[PDB]
Amino acid sequence: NRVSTVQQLTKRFSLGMLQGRGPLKLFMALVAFLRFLTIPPTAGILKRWGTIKKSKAINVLRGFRKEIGRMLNILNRRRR
Amino acid sequence: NRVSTVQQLTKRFSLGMLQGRGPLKLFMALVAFLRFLTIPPTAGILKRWGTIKKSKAINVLRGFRKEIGRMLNILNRRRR
């Protein structure tokens, strides 16, 4: 269908993001995962890509960068 | 169970990774996603955390950093 996959974040973001929300990563994290294995952005991913806030998405992607650096702090203390 | 979730990458990494594989992100991407929403690393995630290669995982996490920067190149060209 290339469009019935973004429905999940379309029903979860009913009232929140544009208002404030908290994490707002659930959407980026999901599409990013698929974007890391096959990059199959359904229709909603693109149509919603240019109709959200960006300030929160870009900040979220920035937090993901800090979250990945933290993962290294986890795989860098194994000692052996 | 806190252990029957890593089984998926345990059956997919049967013969590869230590040999060469290709992406080897499927594992980090999955645990990373959960690590971005609730950080529920099952038993395997930890026991396997200190018994893999790290050079490939760290390189994978580095590729994820380049993949996220690319996502911005996508959410920075919307114009409006």
How would you classify residue A60: left for phi > 0, otherwise alpha for psi between -120 and 50, otherwise beta?
alpha
A36/B58 Cβ within 8 A: no
**Residue B58 near residue A75 (C-beta atoms within 8 A):** yes
- List the single best residue of B17, B30, B34, B68 to mutate versus A (max A Cβ within 10 A): B68
Chain A partners within 8 Å of B75 (Cβ) = 49, 54, 57-58, 61
Are the C-beta atoms of B45 and B1 separated by less than 8 Å?
A: no
Give the C-alpha distances (Å, rounded to integers) separating B27 from A30, B46, B70. 15, 12, 21
Provide the greatest CA pair distance for chain A.
47
List of domains in chain B = 1-80 (1.10.10.930)
Q: Is the Cβ–Cβ distance between B45 and B10 less than 8 Å?
A: no
Joined together, the tokens standing for residue B13 give: 């990494």
Task: Report the SS3 class of residue B15.
Answer: coil
Query: Which chain B residue has the Cα nearest residue A22?
Result: B37
- Please say whether the dihedral angle defined by the alpha carbons of residues A31, A37, A40 and A46, taken in this order, is positive or negative: positive
How wide is the angle at C-alpha A24 spanned by C-alphas A57 and A55, nearest 5°?
25
- Gap between the Cα atoms of A34 and A45, Å rounded: 11
